[PDB]
């Protein structure tokens, strides 16, 4: 079965450089054309670059030619995307995809995708605030972190039902999001309800207990 796994997504300053890599397995790599496609919530899917099976031909759209460089290592079965002079506009999720043809064609297989963030903003852990007040509804406010992502669970994943975690919204400089969980009234505050927030970027992990005010 075909498998494509890319890595290298990270936070980078404008004008900086990055090198995404894509590991391919489950098929004879040197026979297919490979490619990079990026996706944003406001511009959708967007083809970034394609390279032929032999590596001889490489194609790029205008907006990215000159700065990006696609390349392949047919011995290692790895694909690469060298990016330079990144712009805030290159911020996107980058997908590694295969072409069914030896040169270029439609895309039949896609990797999980790696996310790139170009910004001058500094990595900063979030401030976690507990939200205290049939069943009751409690919440958690994760404020001012950067970059994404942040992992929010309740009782370390013990509370699954009734949880709503809203998409982070880019504030002015930093992100902020909220999560709410609802539980039977007989279980709170008679039972403790903690909210856990992990921000891998800053190696931070906070546990905030929701106590009645």
């Amino acid at each position: 079965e075909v498998q494509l796994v890319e890595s290298g997504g990270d936070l980078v300053k404008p004008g900086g450089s990055l090198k995404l890599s894509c590991a391919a397995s489950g098929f004879t790599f040197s026979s297919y054309g490979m490619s990079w496609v990026r996706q944003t919530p406001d511009k959708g899917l967007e083809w970034v670059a394609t390279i032929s099976s032999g590596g001889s031909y490489t194609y790029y759209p205008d907006n990215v030619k000159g700065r990006f460089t696609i390349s392949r290592d047919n011995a290692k079965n790895t694909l690469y995307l060298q990016m330079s002079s990144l712009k805030s506009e290159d911020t996107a999720m980058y997908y590694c995809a295969r072409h069914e043809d030896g040169n270029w064609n439609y895309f039949d297989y896609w990797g999980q995708g790696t996310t790139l963030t170009v910004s001058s903003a500094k990595t900063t852990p979030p401030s976690v605030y507990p939200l205290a007040p049939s069943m009751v509804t409690l919440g958690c406010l994760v404020k001012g972190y950067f970059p994404e992502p942040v992992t929010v669970t309740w009782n370390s994943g013990s509370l699954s039902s009734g949880v709503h975690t809203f998409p982070a919204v880019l504030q002015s400089d930093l992100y902020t999001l909220s999560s709410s969980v609802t539980v039977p009234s007989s279980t709170w505050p008679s039972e403790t309800v903690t909210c856990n927030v992990a921000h891998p970027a800053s190696s931070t992990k906070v546990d905030k207990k929701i106590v009645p005010r």
Binding site: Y59, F107, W110, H164, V169, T182
Partner: protein
């Protein structure tokens, strides 16, 4: 180069109904039109390739037609597992260009939002800030309007709103509304209220607190 106009952008339909998505190319593209399905969080999934040929493994209820500039993708009868985003891609000339997509929504019975308000947490006031959160949960349709009134008077500066995707269990929506404001501004007022007008109610459902 070649431009592809997809439509409709978003389509709300109920289970079992026919779904028709259209993609029109600016230039004759032959039969080199492809279609992809994308569920939230996951990457695109190849459904139909050049020549309107179904990719193997895709249910027969999916199909596409067209040659030239007018292409049609249809789902005979939409099931729960079909709720996703669909994209068309022309692979006739560089640059490869995709359609803008069609986001599908499950049409379900209306439902009022369960609103609740939270005054700022102690430790936040301590750090000089004061955010007031208001959760409006499990409602539908998604269209709703929230307004923050700091003592009868409305506020527009300092509001952050986030919505969730259609729930994969009850097909409903939920949104978070956060009124942030200086600790001072906070302490120097009293009645904070969260007003929400939803298709499901004549009277704007209100939730407030004092001090």
């Amino acid at each position: 180069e070649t431009t592809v106009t997809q439509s409709p952008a978003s389509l709300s339909v109920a289970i079992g109904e026919k779904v028709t998505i259209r993609c029109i190319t600016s230039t004759d593209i032959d039969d080199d039109m492809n279609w992809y399905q994308q569920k939230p969080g996951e990457p695109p999934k190849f459904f139909i390739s050049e020549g309107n040929t179904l990719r193997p493994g895709v249910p027969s209820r999916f199909s596409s037609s067209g040659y030239g500039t007018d292409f049609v993708f249809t789902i005979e009868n939409m099931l729960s597992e079909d709720v996703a985003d669909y994209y068309c891609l022309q692979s006739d000339t560089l640059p490869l260009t995709f359609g803008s997509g069609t986001k599908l929504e499950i049409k379900r019975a209306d439902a009022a939002p369960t609103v609740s308000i939270f005054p700022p947490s102690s430790e936040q006031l301590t750090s000089g800030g004061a955010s007031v959160v208001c959760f409006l949960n499990n409602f539908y349709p998604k269209d709703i309007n929230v307004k923050w009134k700091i003592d009868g008077s409305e506020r527009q500066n300092g509001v952050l709103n986030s919505w969730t995707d259609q729930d994969s269990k009850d097909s409903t929506y939920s949104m978070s509304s956060t009124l942030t404001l200086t600790k001072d501004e906070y302490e120097r007022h009293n009645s904070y209220t969260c007003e929400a007008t939803h298709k499901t109610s004549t009277s704007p459902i209100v939730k407030s607190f004092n001090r």
